[PDB]
UniProtKB/TrEMBL annotation, chain B:
This protein's name: Sigma NS
Presence of the UniProt keyword RNA-binding in the record: yes
GO molecular function (one): RNA-directed RNA polymerase activity
Organism: Avian orthoreovirus
InterPro entries hit by this protein: Reovirus_polyG_pol (IPR002507)
This protein's UniProt keywords: RNA-binding
From TrEMBL, chains C, D:
Protein name: Sigma NS
Superkingdom in the source lineage: Viruses
A GO molecular-function annotation: single-stranded RNA binding
Keyword RNA-binding annotated: yes
Native source species: Avian orthoreovirus
Pfam families: PolyG_pol
InterPro entries with a match to the protein in the record: Reovirus_polyG_pol
Keywords: RNA-binding
Length: 366, 365, 364, 364, 53
């Protein structure tokens, strides 16, 4: 007889959950009650932060979207009240003061003049403006590096040229940003000596930033150790080429970190919601785990991570917000000159005496 | 010394309420809105939910194969037994408010395809013009589940098990829909005939089709339309003598017809309807629960569209009036401009960009 | 280089399975997931499938319409894996997966189902040896309505056993032995090996099991007297098509398959020593095999040894202890222990200390 | 045939409880019904029971005849829970639940009731330490007519105390202090801890409580002549059988039990850290301890801090704050605030802001 | 010896309710669940209109 299976009635739609900080973009958190276990410490997740750290390899991150999504973007972005999250998702500039920042406009102008000649960059970064949304610039530069072309009310234009580095980052799955300074007449890794804003304003500082990329062999191997580092290349080691966008990549990384810091600063204003969700003890732990790619290049994020580890991974939004405000106002806290920086087992380690003050593992580019 | 027999009146005093006792499907249990101050009384149709769940008869009747005798003979053979109980145990009822003449040819068709293997006289008295659609639907479900009826007594889990009932165990969701040959290929179309008309012309039942789907519930793969792998359509299953596909379609249409005749009879219960004008969740709950039958019938589709356009907040009297208007007037809204589309496994009607109606798969287990 | 290149490498493994060429003892061991420590966790997929098969219809409902995989190419290979053949109930001549003991039950099944189904491939007629797992799978699928095709396939066309339909409502199972003590029924510890009961089909009648429903509303009536929501296998109405004896034979045959596989593993000391570092192997083995303790006393002794050793034993020690149990016979005077059934569980207690306990076994 | 239908599992379970060893501070955790990931709903059962015991006959009426359950099993074990012992008025040597302050009041109760009751196990004579909760429960039971058995149980053989027969008519209680300011009686802030005035038992004459009815049904009217339909503890006619002094001693004893448990909470760092997500703990504690705040220094300060922090405090914060209050003495400058009475409510006002507000507790 | 008398609640809180049109003066409404009776037709009351008349 006549048969159509286009009607597909499968359903696997979860149990329950919640979302906090809807107006935010990076610190927008998804909360799930871990009903699988009796313990009631709710589980937390930051989807957009995970996506942002994923996008460090733009081509592998954005390949799936080159064909699939064609349903609607303007219907969402051109809504009556488009969400800042969606707009920054599609590289659209956002007017909110909580998201936008005034410092570090020089890097935004640099990327606009680099890509403005061949892209409608006006909606990403209106010319001459003092306030820019760093997340929008980060998404724009990622998409451009992946070969897309923005539009006023859409982004489904996989028609631009594809960057060489975006193709180079298909072979790698793990990344480790870290500062590098000229010490003892030879190159050496050091603690983050500048906040991201200082080096975005003075873009010459970005030359000091460096990253290391690594492979993920799927073979059933024993856990590889040193002398397997030959299968890895540093960002600055790659040979120079005009299309190869190294400085674009570093600017994207710094811009993402600055967006995180702006969100954390704006979090202090959200005392009402921070109090209403004072029971989310996993906020500090999850944020500490997820931000691990950025702490290696910023003073204040490093201090926040150190204080998180000292406290014991038990901070609700209020505690982390207040501590961030205190770190911003005071600035320097502790004598890190007493501690020392070491690299071991492919991990970025800062230690004082024998104790490991803070441990950073390279992120998942995916 | 003396006996210690005694009783305490352990009861909160304030409890629920039941409405439309005589009606089979439209019987509803009204509960106050929990411990909340909203004072919007909850409504729920138990027999309609059971009817929708019966579309997988084995999974819906596996418990009774072992776990009940319960002296149901007393319930059936009471002086004034509840018509709901009789219709639940596949017994014909002579009440004019639950019997219809339309579709009787399909009734005798099922009565003769199961005539000799079952004492079918008490389910459908031979030669009677009228019949109870709900009783025949329950009889089909029970027989397909591996039971055999008795007059007055409980069902006996002794008969054979149809292959379709066994096949449906793996699936939890159902979505009936019509079919038509357009452009030389089959495509889903809006309902074109009433279930009464399509039962009278039994050949039309070949147009009915449905697609079942599993329930994994693992927190993954939610949005993927690769779930088309984990589905099968009713007409796509390989043919077999014992695979009661046509009985299944007849049972679905029979349940829809039972709902229709009960809605028609609801217009005469004006006293209770106006006495219960304050339960506005009646319409919303009915819309939520009838979602399996709208895709197959004209009038149910029109009623669902009216309910959605009215904001889901209407009482029994409004429902009765609108149903009478739909029955008398015919097709009201303009469906020439209304497109029919399937998106993410949802049977929806769209007018331009406005979504007039959306129907999701019903829970069948 | 312009900059230093200290970097990352993982070679992150994914997926692992050992004890290959076996059917039940196959284990897909893996590293611990959430814990930073790389401890070895275990799971037996085939054993879990066999335990779930005790409700054949609910276990095989999907394959009646959904899967319909290309099974032909799998079994037509030159040297197909034995596990796939046993999963589809094909007799295998491997000495490490066959036994002469219990052939009487195989003959009984052949004569009770051979009259309406091809059966030579499942068990060759008159053969002194047989594969118990193949017969167990065959009887399960035949109860599930399937028909074993000779050409490496199952056709969902046969009739459906009444017991398979009855078992849909019950998610929990409990087998055990019984005896006619003081002119009344009473539960006893296992007094026979599965070989004796398969050989003595009449003796198989003493086996019994109880089934229970699942829910989530909090348990009522002291959580142990909830008895109208449970039933026993032998109390069900007798009927020609209700496969009571086939079900009992299925359970015993699966237990015999497990015993034969353990006996074959008894000689495999090389790989066991190579994998002796895995002690959670014993814990997971106990957890999954718990359904079979209450029918065979030889299995009870292995479970007791594992429990006394602390739910942590290596495959080599398991092999050695199983061989010692098989050779020795009754090792301890278990008559000093006492049998009890409390809070729905099944446990044996010597003095006040609980010697061994059994929990709900989930079948679907 | 064999028809032994042993039951099997039927459902699951949910819930959690913390502080097993503690008695008053033991709490039961339930996930929020509306949404599974909102603030946890905490609740202290034993603290509510202690507050309800302030009308002993109405609290223990059912146990006289109805709930004559097996109690021997609970008491006679290798490790009975301290909560059960204190619930049945048994002295326990646990350091976390024994205090050396106010023991003179304990022996006062012992010599008042020891003549006609085996009071040795409730409070061994000459012990430098004692369990306040045990003595409070003993006083309540004795006033309820029960008699603590030498064999560790209760029997309803003794006489009914006259005060318990009067507190049947009243549902709401409100303790407060009194002083002879300007040669007249007036309510004052708590100037002594219960822990210190249980030493000088003469000071208990300062304590006063006001009882009143849960009046007839009326949907809106806030009062039923609230002053005319209420009575005070010190206003009742005097009589030997009236356990007025025992009643006040029981109240102070329960307060002392709460304070010593809060003191012991400091050492429970592990469970406090593991339950940092339980923010409703402090709000519930503030809600339920409202009967004892109007009699003690430190409880009043703790309640004020809890109100200041906004009714959201995990156990570690409460432990730290209570340690600070105990160590630093009177910290808050209450000199700027004044007391007032509003429609029966007991509140502290500074200017026009309401620093604290306490409502009558419920006795049954 | 020393006595000070204080009040107590006239509890009938089981009859939960709420108000409608709070920003209105006369049409401000108070609705109460049927406590004495089991039926569920919510009874209502306009306080300010009663006061005005």
């Amino acid at each position: 007889d006549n048969t159509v299976r286009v009607g597909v009635s499968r359903n696997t739609s979860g149990a329950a959950g919640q979302t906090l900080f809807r107006n935010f973009y990076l610190l927008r958190c998804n909360i799930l009650a871990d009903g699988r276990n009796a313990t009631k410490a709710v589980q937390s997740h930051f989807p957009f932060l995970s996506r942002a750290v994923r996008c460090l390899s733009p081509l592998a991150a954005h390949c799936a979207d080159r064909t699939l999504r064609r349903d609607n973007v303007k219907q969402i972005l051109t809504r009556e009240l488009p969400f800042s999250s969606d707009l920054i998702n599609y590289a659209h500039h956002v007017n909110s003061s909580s998201l936008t920042t005034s410092q570090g406009v020089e890097a935004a102008r640099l990327v606009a003049q680099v890509y403005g000649e061949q892209v409608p960059f006006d909606h990403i970064y209106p010319t001459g403006s003092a306030t820019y949304c760093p997340g929008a610039i980060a998404n724009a530069i990622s998409r451009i590096m992946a070969g897309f072309v923005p539009r006023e009310g859409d982004d489904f234009a996989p028609s631009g040229p594809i960057d060489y580095l975006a193709a180079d980052l298909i072979a790698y799955k793990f990344v480790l940003p870290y500062m590098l300074d000229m010490v003892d007449g030879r190159p050496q890794i050091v603690l983050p000596s500048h906040t991201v804003e200082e080096m975005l304003t003075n873009t010459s500082l970005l030359n000091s930033i460096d990253a290391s990329f690594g492979i993920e062999a799927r073979s059933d191997q024993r856990m590889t150790r040193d002398a397997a580092e030959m299968s890895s290349r540093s960002l600055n080691e790659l040979e120079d080429h005009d299309q190869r966008g190294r400085m674009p990549w570093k600017i994207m990384l710094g811009m993402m970190a600055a967006q995180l810091k702006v969100e954390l600063d704006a979090l202090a204003d959200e005392r009402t919601e921070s109090q209403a969700n004072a029971h989310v003890t996993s906020f500090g732990s999850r944020l500490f785990n997820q931000m691990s790619a950025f702490v290696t290049i910023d003073h204040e994020l490093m201090e926040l991570a150190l204080l998180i580890k000292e406290q014991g991974f038990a901070m609700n939004p209020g505690q982390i917000a207040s501590k961030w405000s205190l770190i911003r106002r005071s600035g320097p806290t502790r004598p890190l000159s007493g501690a020392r920086l070491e690299i071991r087992n492919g991990n970025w380690m800062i230690r004082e005496g024998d104790q490991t003050l803070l441990s950073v593992s390279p992120a998942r580019m995916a």
